[PDB]
Amino acid sequence: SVKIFSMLEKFGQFHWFYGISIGQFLSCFKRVFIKTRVDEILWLLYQEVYCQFSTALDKKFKMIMAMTMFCLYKFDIESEQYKEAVLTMIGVLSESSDGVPKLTNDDLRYLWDYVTTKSYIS
């Protein structure tokens, strides 16, 4: 929760409209319960906070938020090879680091097929 709030504070730092308040975040966390268990609360938290604070951002920041929240979840939950592969693929999207990823699950194969065929938007 504090990592997400720091992310949203950075979004509010970039533009005056994208600001975030602590009351809104706690209202969203209340709505999480209004609408392996701790991981289920964590997943519901991510889904609700994305569906709540995605509408306050434009297209580019929608993509930024979705990508970095998926990165946060998959990095904290899953293994190190997954993390390294995702950073290398985000880098080759960013054209700052160039290099093929190491094959392990299945979704990374689909992302690799999307990016090798130059389907950036996909």
Side-chain angles (χ1 to χ4, degrees), residues 1-34 36-69 72-80 82-83 85-96 98-101 103-122:
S1 307
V2 73
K3 273 203 296 199
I4 286 180
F5 202 78
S6 67
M7 181 181 72
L8 293 181
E9 286 283 43
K10 290 178 179 64
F11 283 166
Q13 183 178 2
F14 166 97
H15 199 276
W16 54 267
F17 196 76
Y18 301 154
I20 190 65
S21 82
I22 189 71
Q24 269 169 279
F25 188 70
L26 275 296
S27 75
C28 175
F29 207 79
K30 202 173 300 311
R31 204 175 287 114
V32 164
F33 291 112
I34 280 298
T36 59
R37 182 73 179 101
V38 182
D39 55 347
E40 189 188 301
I41 294 91
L42 184 54
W43 190 58
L44 265 296
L45 161 64
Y46 288 167
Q47 297 273 343
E48 274 293 326
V49 76
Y50 179 69
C51 298
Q52 177 69 41
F53 302 113
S54 168
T55 67
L57 323 173
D58 65 318
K59 202 202 181 223
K60 177 173 79 72
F61 272 93
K62 270 161 185 156
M63 296 175 180
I64 284 156
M65 182 169 199
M67 185 180 288
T68 189
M69 290 177 68
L72 286 184
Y73 177 76
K74 289 318 198 262
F75 281 38
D76 188 70
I77 291 308
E78 303 197 330
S79 77
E80 186 42 60
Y82 201 105
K83 154 168 186 176
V86 175
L87 303 171
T88 60
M89 293 177 71
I90 289 181
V92 67
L93 266 71
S94 74
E95 274 162 18
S96 68
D98 301 333
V100 293
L103 191 149
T104 78
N105 198 268
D106 57 338
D107 48 354
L108 273 71
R109 314 272 80 80
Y110 283 61
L111 196 58
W112 190 227
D113 290 329
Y114 284 165
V115 64
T116 45
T117 58
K118 301 286 100 176
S119 313
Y120 296 103
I121 285 307
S122 179

